[PDB]
Amino acid sequence: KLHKEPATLIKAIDGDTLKLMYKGQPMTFRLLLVDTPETKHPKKGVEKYGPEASAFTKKMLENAKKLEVEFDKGQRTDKYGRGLAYLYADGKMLNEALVRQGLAKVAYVYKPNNTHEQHLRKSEAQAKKEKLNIWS
């Protein structure tokens, strides 16, 4: 079964990429199953809702009492050396929260790293139904 382990925030970089202390080491983490709009796109500077997503993530993590990371059952790092995980702030999944608010869409999915896929797609469908943010 997936297990939750503790982590400490170092810096939020944008909506879906974070620097955390994990096991005593500084690491970049990329959120599983979701994509927030870019703020640093080499091409097109900020995408609509990029700054919003990024501040949402920064607020939720900076104000948390406890952060936890949850790896899925497949690869735990990507080709750029980032940890691939679900992030929980006081027990609430950051990946889901972003999607539920219309600030992220569900990513292209890669088995077997897809354990929370149905829950996130459920939240995405609700955000679209409510026409929130990127869905407006």
mmCIF file of N, CA, C and O in Angstrom, residues 19-76:
data_model
loop_
_atom_site.group_PDB
_atom_site.id
_atom_site.type_symbol
_atom_site.label_atom_id
_atom_site.label_comp_id
_atom_site.label_asym_id
_atom_site.label_seq_id
_atom_site.Cartn_x
_atom_site.Cartn_y
_atom_site.Cartn_z
ATOM 1 N N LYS A 19 10.456 22.499 -4.127
ATOM 2 C CA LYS A 19 11.680 22.091 -3.449
ATOM 3 C C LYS A 19 11.350 21.696 -2.028
ATOM 4 O O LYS A 19 10.838 22.579 -1.329
ATOM 5 N N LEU A 20 11.636 20.458 -1.642
ATOM 6 C CA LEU A 20 11.331 19.964 -0.314
ATOM 7 C C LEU A 20 12.586 19.358 0.314
ATOM 8 O O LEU A 20 13.467 18.893 -0.406
ATOM 9 N N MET A 21 12.619 19.351 1.637
ATOM 10 C CA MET A 21 13.595 18.535 2.345
ATOM 11 C C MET A 21 12.923 17.187 2.565
ATOM 12 O O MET A 21 11.858 17.098 3.183
ATOM 13 N N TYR A 22 13.524 16.120 2.040
ATOM 14 C CA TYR A 22 12.973 14.776 2.167
ATOM 15 C C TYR A 22 14.069 13.835 2.664
ATOM 16 O O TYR A 22 15.130 13.762 2.028
ATOM 17 N N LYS A 23 13.860 13.151 3.769
ATOM 18 C CA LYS A 23 14.967 12.331 4.274
ATOM 19 C C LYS A 23 16.243 13.116 4.511
ATOM 20 O O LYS A 23 17.328 12.560 4.305
ATOM 21 N N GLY A 24 16.189 14.388 4.889
ATOM 22 C CA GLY A 24 17.418 15.122 5.137
ATOM 23 C C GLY A 24 18.110 15.649 3.910
ATOM 24 O O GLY A 24 19.190 16.237 3.985
ATOM 25 N N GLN A 25 17.534 15.498 2.721
ATOM 26 C CA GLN A 25 18.197 16.011 1.523
ATOM 27 C C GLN A 25 17.281 16.978 0.778
ATOM 28 O O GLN A 25 16.073 16.756 0.754
ATOM 29 N N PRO A 26 17.821 18.026 0.181
ATOM 30 C CA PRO A 26 17.027 18.919 -0.667
ATOM 31 C C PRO A 26 16.745 18.230 -1.998
ATOM 32 O O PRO A 26 17.664 17.690 -2.616
ATOM 33 N N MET A 27 15.485 18.245 -2.398
ATOM 34 C CA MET A 27 15.039 17.630 -3.637
ATOM 35 C C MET A 27 13.959 18.447 -4.334
ATOM 36 O O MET A 27 13.114 19.036 -3.667
ATOM 37 N N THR A 28 13.964 18.455 -5.652
ATOM 38 C CA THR A 28 12.837 18.964 -6.416
ATOM 39 C C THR A 28 11.791 17.875 -6.596
ATOM 40 O O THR A 28 12.137 16.729 -6.893
ATOM 41 N N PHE A 29 10.517 18.212 -6.371
ATOM 42 C CA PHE A 29 9.401 17.305 -6.533
ATOM 43 C C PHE A 29 8.455 17.901 -7.572
ATOM 44 O O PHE A 29 8.273 19.110 -7.669
ATOM 45 N N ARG A 30 7.851 17.026 -8.343
ATOM 46 C CA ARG A 30 6.894 17.351 -9.376
ATOM 47 C C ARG A 30 5.594 16.651 -9.007
ATOM 48 O O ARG A 30 5.632 15.462 -8.710
ATOM 49 N N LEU A 31 4.451 17.324 -8.974
ATOM 50 C CA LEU A 31 3.225 16.665 -8.546
ATOM 51 C C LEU A 31 2.724 15.649 -9.583
ATOM 52 O O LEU A 31 2.649 15.972 -10.768
ATOM 53 N N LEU A 32 2.376 14.456 -9.122
ATOM 54 C CA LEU A 32 1.802 13.451 -10.016
ATOM 55 C C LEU A 32 0.421 13.824 -10.552
ATOM 56 O O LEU A 32 -0.358 14.369 -9.782
ATOM 57 N N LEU A 33 0.106 13.545 -11.799
ATOM 58 C CA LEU A 33 -1.194 13.434 -12.422
ATOM 59 C C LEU A 33 -1.817 14.783 -12.728
ATOM 60 O O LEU A 33 -2.951 14.871 -13.205
ATOM 61 N N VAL A 34 -1.080 15.831 -12.425
ATOM 62 C CA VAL A 34 -1.687 17.152 -12.679
ATOM 63 C C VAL A 34 -0.689 18.065 -13.369
ATOM 64 O O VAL A 34 0.533 17.973 -13.242
ATOM 65 N N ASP A 35 -1.230 19.005 -14.147
ATOM 66 C CA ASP A 35 -0.434 20.046 -14.754
ATOM 67 C C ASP A 35 -1.029 21.429 -14.446
ATOM 68 O O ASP A 35 -2.146 21.699 -14.881
ATOM 69 N N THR A 36 -0.284 22.280 -13.761
ATOM 70 C CA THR A 36 -0.691 23.671 -13.618
ATOM 71 C C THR A 36 -0.128 24.506 -14.764
ATOM 72 O O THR A 36 0.906 24.193 -15.344
ATOM 73 N N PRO A 37 -0.786 25.614 -15.084
ATOM 74 C CA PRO A 37 -0.278 26.483 -16.144
ATOM 75 C C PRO A 37 1.105 27.014 -15.767
ATOM 76 O O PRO A 37 1.459 27.196 -14.598
ATOM 77 N N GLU A 38 1.916 27.250 -16.789
ATOM 78 C CA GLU A 38 3.285 27.712 -16.668
ATOM 79 C C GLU A 38 3.376 29.159 -16.215
ATOM 80 O O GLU A 38 2.494 29.961 -16.528
ATOM 81 N N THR A 39 4.460 29.463 -15.519
ATOM 82 C CA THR A 39 4.822 30.823 -15.174
ATOM 83 C C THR A 39 6.201 31.174 -15.741
ATOM 84 O O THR A 39 6.514 32.364 -15.824
ATOM 85 N N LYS A 40 6.969 30.149 -16.098
ATOM 86 C CA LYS A 40 8.333 30.320 -16.574
ATOM 87 C C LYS A 40 8.534 29.762 -17.975
ATOM 88 O O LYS A 40 9.675 29.447 -18.320
ATOM 89 N N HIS A 41 7.466 29.638 -18.755
ATOM 90 C CA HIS A 41 7.576 29.073 -20.096
ATOM 91 C C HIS A 41 8.580 29.844 -20.942
ATOM 92 O O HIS A 41 8.498 31.061 -21.088
ATOM 93 N N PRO A 42 9.542 29.133 -21.509
ATOM 94 C CA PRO A 42 10.637 29.803 -22.219
ATOM 95 C C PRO A 42 10.056 30.605 -23.390
ATOM 96 O O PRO A 42 10.504 31.705 -23.705
ATOM 97 N N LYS A 43 9.051 29.955 -23.958
ATOM 98 C CA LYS A 43 8.233 30.374 -25.066
ATOM 99 C C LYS A 43 7.328 31.532 -24.657
ATOM 100 O O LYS A 43 7.679 32.699 -24.824
ATOM 101 N N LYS A 44 6.176 31.147 -24.117
ATOM 102 C CA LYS A 44 5.193 32.123 -23.677
ATOM 103 C C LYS A 44 5.271 32.319 -22.159
ATOM 104 O O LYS A 44 4.846 31.395 -21.470
ATOM 105 N N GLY A 45 5.785 33.463 -21.755
ATOM 106 C CA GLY A 45 5.938 33.919 -20.393
ATOM 107 C C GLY A 45 4.919 33.321 -19.457
ATOM 108 O O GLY A 45 4.928 32.111 -19.193
ATOM 109 N N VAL A 46 3.966 34.081 -18.908
ATOM 110 C CA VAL A 46 3.067 33.336 -18.023
ATOM 111 C C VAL A 46 1.813 32.928 -18.774
ATOM 112 O O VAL A 46 1.271 33.702 -19.555
ATOM 113 N N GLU A 47 1.364 31.707 -18.509
ATOM 114 C CA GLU A 47 0.079 31.295 -19.047
ATOM 115 C C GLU A 47 -1.012 31.794 -18.102
ATOM 116 O O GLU A 47 -0.767 32.003 -16.909
ATOM 117 N N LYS A 48 -2.195 31.968 -18.670
ATOM 118 C CA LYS A 48 -3.350 32.336 -17.865
ATOM 119 C C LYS A 48 -3.505 31.337 -16.716
ATOM 120 O O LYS A 48 -3.416 30.137 -16.966
ATOM 121 N N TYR A 49 -3.724 31.875 -15.528
ATOM 122 C CA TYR A 49 -3.889 31.108 -14.303
ATOM 123 C C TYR A 49 -2.580 30.560 -13.753
ATOM 124 O O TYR A 49 -2.576 29.958 -12.677
ATOM 125 N N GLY A 50 -1.444 30.755 -14.420
ATOM 126 C CA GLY A 50 -0.151 30.383 -13.843
ATOM 127 C C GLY A 50 0.153 31.015 -12.509
ATOM 128 O O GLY A 50 0.467 30.343 -11.516
ATOM 129 N N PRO A 51 0.098 32.335 -12.403
ATOM 130 C CA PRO A 51 0.356 33.001 -11.128
ATOM 131 C C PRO A 51 -0.635 32.586 -10.046
ATOM 132 O O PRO A 51 -0.188 32.405 -8.919
ATOM 133 N N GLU A 52 -1.906 32.454 -10.389
ATOM 134 C CA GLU A 52 -2.932 31.971 -9.482
ATOM 135 C C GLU A 52 -2.642 30.575 -8.927
ATOM 136 O O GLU A 52 -2.719 30.351 -7.722
ATOM 137 N N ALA A 53 -2.330 29.619 -9.798
ATOM 138 C CA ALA A 53 -2.003 28.256 -9.361
ATOM 139 C C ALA A 53 -0.836 28.250 -8.404
ATOM 140 O O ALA A 53 -0.753 27.662 -7.328
ATOM 141 N N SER A 54 0.178 28.999 -8.855
ATOM 142 C CA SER A 54 1.424 29.045 -8.078
ATOM 143 C C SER A 54 1.143 29.661 -6.723
ATOM 144 O O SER A 54 1.715 29.289 -5.687
ATOM 145 N N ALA A 55 0.233 30.641 -6.631
ATOM 146 C CA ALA A 55 0.072 31.231 -5.285
ATOM 147 C C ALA A 55 -0.801 30.327 -4.433
ATOM 148 O O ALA A 55 -0.680 30.317 -3.204
ATOM 149 N N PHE A 56 -1.696 29.615 -5.137
ATOM 150 C CA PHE A 56 -2.532 28.664 -4.383
ATOM 151 C C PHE A 56 -1.651 27.637 -3.703
ATOM 152 O O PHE A 56 -1.724 27.344 -2.514
ATOM 153 N N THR A 57 -0.754 27.034 -4.500
ATOM 154 C CA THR A 57 0.160 26.062 -3.903
ATOM 155 C C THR A 57 1.012 26.629 -2.807
ATOM 156 O O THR A 57 1.233 26.078 -1.733
ATOM 157 N N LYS A 58 1.540 27.830 -3.033
ATOM 158 C CA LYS A 58 2.437 28.436 -2.037
ATOM 159 C C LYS A 58 1.709 28.695 -0.728
ATOM 160 O O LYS A 58 2.213 28.377 0.359
ATOM 161 N N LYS A 59 0.493 29.245 -0.764
ATOM 162 C CA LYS A 59 -0.332 29.449 0.417
ATOM 163 C C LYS A 59 -0.682 28.168 1.143
ATOM 164 O O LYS A 59 -0.584 28.058 2.374
ATOM 165 N N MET A 60 -1.115 27.140 0.406
ATOM 166 C CA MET A 60 -1.524 25.903 1.082
ATOM 167 C C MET A 60 -0.350 25.242 1.788
ATOM 168 O O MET A 60 -0.452 24.663 2.875
ATOM 169 N N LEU A 61 0.840 25.289 1.185
ATOM 170 C CA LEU A 61 1.972 24.614 1.813
ATOM 171 C C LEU A 61 2.619 25.460 2.905
ATOM 172 O O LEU A 61 3.043 24.883 3.893
ATOM 173 N N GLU A 62 2.704 26.770 2.698
ATOM 174 C CA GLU A 62 3.369 27.600 3.700
ATOM 175 C C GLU A 62 2.568 27.682 4.994
ATOM 176 O O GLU A 62 3.156 27.793 6.065
ATOM 177 N N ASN A 63 1.244 27.642 4.908
ATOM 178 C CA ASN A 63 0.370 27.672 6.066
ATOM 179 C C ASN A 63 0.077 26.292 6.614
ATOM 180 O O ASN A 63 -0.792 26.191 7.473
ATOM 181 N N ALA A 64 0.738 25.220 6.167
ATOM 182 C CA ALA A 64 0.379 23.911 6.736
ATOM 183 C C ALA A 64 1.085 23.586 8.048
ATOM 184 O O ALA A 64 2.212 23.971 8.349
ATOM 185 N N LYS A 65 0.432 22.811 8.920
ATOM 186 C CA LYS A 65 1.137 22.338 10.101
ATOM 187 C C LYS A 65 2.092 21.189 9.752
ATOM 188 O O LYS A 65 3.170 21.148 10.336
ATOM 189 N N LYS A 66 1.671 20.306 8.858
ATOM 190 C CA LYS A 66 2.395 19.116 8.440
ATOM 191 C C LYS A 66 2.334 18.872 6.932
ATOM 192 O O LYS A 66 1.220 18.906 6.384
ATOM 193 N N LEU A 67 3.481 18.621 6.301
ATOM 194 C CA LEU A 67 3.512 18.204 4.885
ATOM 195 C C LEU A 67 3.924 16.723 4.813
ATOM 196 O O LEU A 67 4.822 16.310 5.559
ATOM 197 N N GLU A 68 3.262 15.988 3.923
ATOM 198 C CA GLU A 68 3.626 14.591 3.674
ATOM 199 C C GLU A 68 3.691 14.335 2.176
ATOM 200 O O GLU A 68 2.866 14.903 1.453
ATOM 201 N N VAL A 69 4.643 13.494 1.784
ATOM 202 C CA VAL A 69 4.707 13.027 0.397
ATOM 203 C C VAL A 69 4.292 11.553 0.348
ATOM 204 O O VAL A 69 4.485 10.776 1.275
ATOM 205 N N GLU A 70 3.673 11.188 -0.769
ATOM 206 C CA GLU A 70 3.190 9.850 -1.029
ATOM 207 C C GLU A 70 3.676 9.479 -2.430
ATOM 208 O O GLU A 70 3.187 10.040 -3.402
ATOM 209 N N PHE A 71 4.651 8.544 -2.483
ATOM 210 C CA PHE A 71 4.967 8.028 -3.817
ATOM 211 C C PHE A 71 3.914 7.054 -4.332
ATOM 212 O O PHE A 71 3.227 6.422 -3.529
ATOM 213 N N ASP A 72 3.810 6.933 -5.654
ATOM 214 C CA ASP A 72 2.865 5.947 -6.211
ATOM 215 C C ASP A 72 3.590 4.603 -6.328
ATOM 216 O O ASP A 72 4.643 4.384 -5.735
ATOM 217 N N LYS A 73 3.072 3.627 -7.059
ATOM 218 C CA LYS A 73 3.670 2.289 -7.026
ATOM 219 C C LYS A 73 4.700 2.072 -8.138
ATOM 220 O O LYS A 73 5.281 0.984 -8.185
ATOM 221 N N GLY A 74 4.967 3.034 -9.011
ATOM 222 C CA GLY A 74 5.928 2.963 -10.088
ATOM 223 C C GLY A 74 7.194 3.765 -9.832
ATOM 224 O O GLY A 74 7.662 3.850 -8.706
ATOM 225 N N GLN A 75 7.773 4.350 -10.867
ATOM 226 C CA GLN A 75 9.000 5.123 -10.760
ATOM 227 C C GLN A 75 8.815 6.281 -9.781
ATOM 228 O O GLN A 75 7.741 6.881 -9.871
ATOM 229 N N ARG A 76 9.798 6.540 -8.947
ATOM 230 C CA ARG A 76 9.654 7.596 -7.947
ATOM 231 C C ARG A 76 10.371 8.867 -8.340
ATOM 232 O O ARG A 76 10.210 9.873 -7.650
#
